[PDB]
C-alpha cells in the first residue's frame, strides 16, 4: 500500500546538515538515517552504529557499524560517517547544528566498519546531538561529486529511496528493499503532499484526499478527534516565545528583555491564537522532568503592565522605541501570536511592526539572524538537558535556528558547560537550577505557553506515532512502523 501525507509546507531544502523546519526534517527521517536516532518511545536507538561505547569521562566515543547500503548499493563505512560529520564542523559550511557538535576534535577510522571520535571537551549529550535529523550520515562519494550541486537527489540509508520531487506540489518515497531492519518499512510508498494552508491541508484529511496530516490547527482539533473515520493524535512539547537579536540596542538590554516578559498577556495569546488550548509559562520552559525545573521558580514572571513600563522608563526608554517583528503568515499560530504580542507592546509604548512573509522566507531571514526579534515555536532538540546549549549558549557560532543572536554570557557558558561534563545528575541538577536563575535574570529568549502539537490520522491508518514531549519534531521517524488498510483515493 501507499499512504499520502499532508506536510505543513514544502521543504525549502532537503539539503541534511540545515535545519528547515519540521516539513523538511518529515521527509529528511523517511530517507536518511544517523549513527543513533530516537525510537518512538524516546530512547536512543543503534541504527547505522550496531553499538557503542563511550568513554567514563564522556570525551571518547566507538562506534562499531551495522552491516548497511546506501540507496545506491554501496555499502555504509566510516569514511561515509567522517565525511558527514566533517560537512557539519565546517566553519564554513551551513549546518545549524555546528556549535553543538564543534566538541568533536579528531574522527578516526582505524577500519572500515569503525568509528572513533574525541571531544575537545566532554559531553554526556554527543550521543543525542547524533541523533539529530541533521546529522544523518549520507555517502563520502555522494557529497564530492554533489559538492555543487545544492538540488541533487538524496542518497541516504533510511528506510525510505528518494523517488522524486515535483515542485509546488510534493515528494515521493520508496520502499528500500534493502534497509537493515526485518519487514520494514510496511509501505511501499509515501507520497508527502505539501499543503501551506491550513485549511486546504484539514480539508484534504476530512474529504479523504490524503492518509496525515501534521499541524492540525487548534480550532479543528475537537472535530478530528471526534471522528468516526478520522483520529488525532495529541502531544504538548513545543512551547511559544520569543528570540532577540541583542544587537538591536533595546534587545542587549535584559531589562527590555524583562518588561516584554511582563507585559505580554499569556492568556491574550492562548485565546487568540490557539483557540483557549495550552498552558501559560512564566518563566523558563523547562518540562517536568528535566533538570533545572523548578515550581517555586515557575512564577518568576506575571502580567504586569505597569511594571513592565517601568522597567523601560529604568532601561533608558521612556516613551518607548519602534521595533520590527518577525513571524509567518504560512501558520496562523505564528500569525496570531505575533498579532498578540504587538497589541500587547503597544501598550507599553513599544510600536511593533509585523513581517509575515511565508516559512521558507522567515527562516532563511532567522539563519542569518536578519531580524530584531521573532516569534519562536520550539523545543528542545534532544531529551537531555543539555537542550539548553543550543538555545543559551555563546561560542563561535553566534547565530542559530533556537538562540537569541549573539547573547553571549560568560557564566551561563561556564555553568552549561559544567552540566555537559558532569556526568552523576545528582550533580548536574545543582548546576541546571544555578544556570535557571542565571537564564531568568538575563532573560535572553522569552517564553509565553505550553502548546498542543497533533497529527491527524484516517481511520485505517495505525503504526504512526507523534512522539513524546521534544520529539515531536521527529515523528517522521515513525513512518516506517506506519501501515495502512486496503483503500481508494475516490475510486
Ligand atoms: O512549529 C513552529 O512553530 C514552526 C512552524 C514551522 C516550523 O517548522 N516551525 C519550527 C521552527 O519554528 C523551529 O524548528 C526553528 O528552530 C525556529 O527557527 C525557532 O524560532
Ligand atoms: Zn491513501
Ligand atoms: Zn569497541
Ligand atoms: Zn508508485
Ligand atoms: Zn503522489
Ligand atoms: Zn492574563
Ligand atoms: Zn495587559
Redo the contacts with the bound molecule.
Sequence with gaps: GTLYFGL??EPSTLDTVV???????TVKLAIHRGLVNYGIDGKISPELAESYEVSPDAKEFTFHLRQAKFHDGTTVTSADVKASLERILDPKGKA?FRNELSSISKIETPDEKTVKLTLSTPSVAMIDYLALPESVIVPAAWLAKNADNPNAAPVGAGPFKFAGWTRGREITVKKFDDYYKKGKPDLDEVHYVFYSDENTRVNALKSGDVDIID?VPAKDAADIAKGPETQLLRNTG?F?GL?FNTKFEPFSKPEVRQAIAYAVDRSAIINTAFNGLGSPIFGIAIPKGYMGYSDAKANYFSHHVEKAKALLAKAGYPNGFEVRLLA?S??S??QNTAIAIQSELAKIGIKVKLDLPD?ASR?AK??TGDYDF??????G?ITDADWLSNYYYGGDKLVR??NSPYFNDQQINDLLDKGRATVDKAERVKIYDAFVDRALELSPLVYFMW?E?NYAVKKGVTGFTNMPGFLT?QSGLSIENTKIEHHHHHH
Design positions: 505543513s509546507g535545519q528547515p523546519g519540521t516539513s523538511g526534517r545549524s499541524y513545543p511559544m528570540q509567518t504560512q501558520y499560530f505564528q516559512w527562516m532567522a539563519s521573532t516569534v519562536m515555536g520550539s523545543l532538540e535556528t533556537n502548546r502539537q519534531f
